[PDB]
Design a protein around this nucleic acid. Structure first.
Ligand SMILES: [K+]
Ligand SMILES: [Mg+2]
Lengths: 92, 102, 55, 95, 144, 354
RNA sequence: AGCAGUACAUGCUAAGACUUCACCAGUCAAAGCGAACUAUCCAAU
């Protein structure tokens, strides 16, 4: 349960919640899964390493600027044209 | 002293992506839908599906000087035709599967 | 003894040591090229160094 | 091929085969392409890449290589950090 | 115990014709390398110039016409001195770009000939489309 | 062995006796114009159109919409010709065109376009988006009545719906503002349907909104047969079609059978099929207007599932078929070492009995 | 025909195929990364 995680710092829990909202379920539980290995030891180690990267990435405020994925590029152009269609209430 | 060139996959045959449909010294069969061309004019499937041979109107690229000269000298009303080979995609690109119930 | 084209080895100026053989006309000065260099993963100046064979 | 050595009365291995081939425990033989190191200047990148591949021998060749080598060369080995370790056993092979 | 609203089919069926195209996973018709123009697109801009009129179409690779602007239309014709000049070609681009955004069409390919591309009419028509939000270049297909 | 052609062969009318005297194309464009025309024509031989062209019923699509308005062509042509002569008379108009400074008012163009070609262009767009295929099982109507739907985004802004433009679920959280030209005494039905939203049945739809017996343009006074529900496209399910349908009633209609509770948060109760709904009321109401937009998942959708729908949010992924490999053989002659990796399921070393 | 022109990402990697045929050798190639974005042994190192 991310919100009530004493071990994680309160500013970090907020940043993790927005960044990894897609992982948090209806109950507010951050869910991490790994299936990259046959052995449960390696799978569990992958999940724990994921938790560590989340806390580290959260505390590193200057997120590195990087080239967007090709999927993001068109979505940016689509979002830009969608705003172009927005109009203003003529009489308000 | 002979070699084997020609249609590897006949009409209605099932091909996988990368299958060589035909090999030719010169363009005898032209690439249609989902059919790639190699450096040696080899025709290969770009998708999985059924091979089809059709007769389509031929329009060369505007910068293909040799071919553009031919069509410009044709009598008006005359259309060039060529044999094209196509692959009809048999399967969809993918499906949407339920993966989580958050 | 004589050929129209010469096979010569181009060495990268980066000092990595990557070299590739290339063909140039016999009656030409030492060739310099911006050939791609795998070691540095980018294009780099290449200097003609040694004659390998005559075609 | 020597089937019965003069001093031991035992079959002998053809050392020419050991120099050129790798035998996987599953019975496959790996080899290099002929001329992979020769005249690279006159070969296209695509031709050069397939020339440096490690390729399998056919059934007929594999059975011949098996006869030319004694049982020692067919034993299972457990070399440390062997690059071909995973290839010694076949997977999902119905036949 | 089982919520009624939580009944979900294992496979989702999206019948939207543009769904896979919008996601960039729909396959374009590759091939036709020896002939002109290419079929490797989802949507294309085609400009038909006649002796008296200018017409610009946005059509799917399957041959359907999504949106179109033509000087034959009275809505456009009444504001034009001439329907066959550069101004008409620029006006068609501006009108078509607006109709494209309204139809959710943001990307398409333009396949002109060497002389058509050089001409000022197509340069002005292309500029109007780009200034109207149309990119005139499609995103690459996502194979993996 | 030769077989006679099964019809007129191409380039057969061309008289070869006087080849020099015939008129040649002389240009790439003229040949291409003729080439495209010939391709469209039907041919007895096998063509690309056969295998790839869609197979649709030859019978013409039934028209279930309002009748076309009556126009006097003679008077219309008269006024238009006089309008162009007036415009061309101005010296400033000719100078602007010659100097390439003239432009057209986009707003005035769209106003006239809505009155004239707009209904037929909206029908073409609806046909391209499959609305007729999915809503009326291939039946088509011309949206004679321009339907203006806009979503109030914030206080001073409005997100319009223009037949396919993308609107986010956040912008569609509240019922939109709907306006149309209706004469006094008329009664209308307005429904909002999600063609691609249904999570259980492929062919079913969700009734997001249904207003019936609307007197004129007063949408607020229309009976709320189904309360408005925001579009909830599932995450990873792609782009969904949301279509507003305006029906022109011929008389007051009893929609008790189609009524739904207020609030209606049961997906079973909102399961809807426009064809079945229209089929029972075809006698009394005619499809008049059409608007639609494209919607994809956004953060606001999660609120709809957890709060409004009281369910867990379903997530989907686009899954491609597993790569094809030929049946593995015991001896893969001339294949690279990596051939064995194509048929390997685990990357970690295995030890068997040891 | 036992070559030439002219480029220097004739880079890397990798599904699936072809092949004079038996072998050896030879040939084509999607996607991806990065760019552009228009004979054997022998002998020399
Ligand atoms: K659905
Ligand atoms: Mg590629």
């Amino acid at each position: 349960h991310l919100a009530t995680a004493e071990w994680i710092a309160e500013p970090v829990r907020q940043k993790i919640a927005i960044t990894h909202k897609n992982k948090i379920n209806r109950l507010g539980e951050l869910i991490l899964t790994s299936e990259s290995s046959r052995y449960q030891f390696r799978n569990l180690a992958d999940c724990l390493q994921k938790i560590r990267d989340m806390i580290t990435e959260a505390s590193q405020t200057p997120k590195e600027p990087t080239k967007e994925d090709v999927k993001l590029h068109r979505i940016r152009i689509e979002n830009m044209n969608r705003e172009r269609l927005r109009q203003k209430r003529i009489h308000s | 002293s002979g070699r084997r060139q020609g249609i590897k996959k006949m009409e209605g045959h099932y091909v996988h992506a990368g299958n060589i449909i035909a090999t030719q010294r010169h363009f005898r069969w032209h690439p249609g839908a989902h059919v790639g061309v190699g450096k040696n004019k080899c025709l290969y499937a770009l998708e999985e599906g059924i091979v089809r041979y059709t007769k389509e109107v031929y329009v060369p690229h505007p910068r293909n000087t040799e071919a553009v000269d031919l069509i410009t000298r044709l009598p008006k009303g005359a259309v060039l035709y060529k044999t094209f080979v196509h692959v009809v995609p048999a399967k969809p690109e993918g499906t949407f599967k339920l993966v989580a119930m958050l | 003894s004589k050929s129209k084209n010469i096979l010569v080895r181009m060495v990268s100026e980066a000092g990595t040591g990557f070299c590739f053989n290339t063909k140039r006309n016999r009656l030409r000065e030492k060739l310099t090229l911006l050939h791609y260099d795998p070691v540095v993963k980018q294009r780099v100046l290449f200097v003609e160094k040694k004659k390998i064979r005559s075609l | 091929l020597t089937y019965f050595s003069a001093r031991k009365g035992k079959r002998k291995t053809v050392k020419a085969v050991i120099d050129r081939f790798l035998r996987l425990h599953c019975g496959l033989w790996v080899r290099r392409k002929a001329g992979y190191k020769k005249k690279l200047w006159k070969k296209t990148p695509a031709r050069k890449k397939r020339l440096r591949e490690f390729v399998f021998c056919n059934k007929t060749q594999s059975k011949l290589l098996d006869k030319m080598t004694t049982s020692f060369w067919k034993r299972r080995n457990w070399y440390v950090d062997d690059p071909y370790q995973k290839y010694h056993d076949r997977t999902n092979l119905k036949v | 115990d089982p919520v009624e609203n939580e009944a979900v089919a294992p496979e989702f069926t999206n019948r939207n014709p543009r769904n896979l195209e919008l996601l960039s996973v729909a396959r374009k018709e590759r091939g036709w390398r020896t002939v002109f123009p290419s079929r490797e697109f989802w949507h294309r801009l085609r400009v038909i110039r006649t002796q008296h009129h200018v017409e610009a179409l946005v059509e799917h690779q399957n041959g359907k016409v999504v949106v179109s602007a033509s000087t034959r239309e009275w809505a456009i014709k009444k504001h034009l001195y001439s329907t066959r000049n550069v101004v008409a070609c620029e006006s068609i681009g501006r009108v078509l770009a607006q109709r494209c955004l309204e139809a959710g069409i943001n990307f398409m390919v333009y396949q002109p000939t060497p002389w058509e591309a050089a001409s000022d009419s197509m340069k002005r028509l292309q500029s109007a489309m780009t200034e109207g939000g149309v990119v005139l270049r499609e995103p690459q297909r996502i194979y993996e | 062995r030769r077989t006679p052609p099964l019809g007129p062969m191409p380039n057969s009318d061309i008289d070869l006796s006087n080849l020099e005297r015939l008129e040649k194309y002389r240009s790439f464009d003229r040949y291409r114009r003729r080439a495209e025309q010939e391709a469209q024509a039907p041919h007895w031989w096998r063509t690309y159109r056969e295998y790839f062209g869609e197979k649709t019923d030859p019978k013409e699509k039934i028209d279930i919409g309002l009748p076309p308005p009556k126009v006097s062509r003679t008077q219309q042509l008269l006024e238009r010709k006089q309008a162009i002569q007036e415009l061309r008379a101005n010296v400033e108009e000719e100078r602007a065109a010659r100097l390439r400074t003239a432009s057209v008012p986009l707003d005035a163009v769209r106003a006239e376009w809505e009155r004239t070609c707009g209904p037929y262009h909206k029908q073409r767009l609806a046909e391209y988006y499959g609305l007729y295929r999915d809503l009326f099982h291939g039946a088509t109507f011309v949206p004679r009545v321009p339907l203006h739907v806009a979503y109030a985004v914030g206080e001073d802004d409005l997100m319009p719906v223009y037949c396919g433009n993308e609107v986010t679920p956040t912008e569609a959280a509240q019922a939109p503002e709907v306006t149309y030209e209706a004469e006094e005494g008329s009664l209308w039905t307005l429904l909002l349907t999600s063609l691609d939203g249904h999570l259980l049945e492929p062919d079913a739809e969700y009734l997001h909104w249904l207003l019936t017996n609307i007197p004129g343009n007063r949408v607020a006074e229309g009976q709320v047969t189904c309360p408005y529900l925001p579009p909830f496209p599932a995450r990873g399910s792609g782009i969904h079609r949301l279509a507003f349908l305006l029906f022109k009633q011929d008389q007051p209609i009893d929609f008790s059978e189609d009524a739904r509770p207020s609030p209606c948060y049961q997906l079973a109760q909102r399961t809807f099929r426009t064809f079945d709904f229209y089929k029972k009321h075809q006698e009394t109401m005619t499809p008049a207007g059409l608007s639609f937009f494209q919607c994809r998942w956004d953060d606001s959708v999660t609120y709809i599932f957890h709060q409004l729908l009281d369910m867990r949010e379903p997530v989907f992924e686009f899954v491609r078929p597993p790569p094809y490999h030929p049946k593995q053989k015991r001896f893969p002659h001339r294949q690279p070492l990596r051939y064995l990796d194509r048929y390997r399921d685990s990357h970690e070393p295995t030890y068997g009995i040891y």
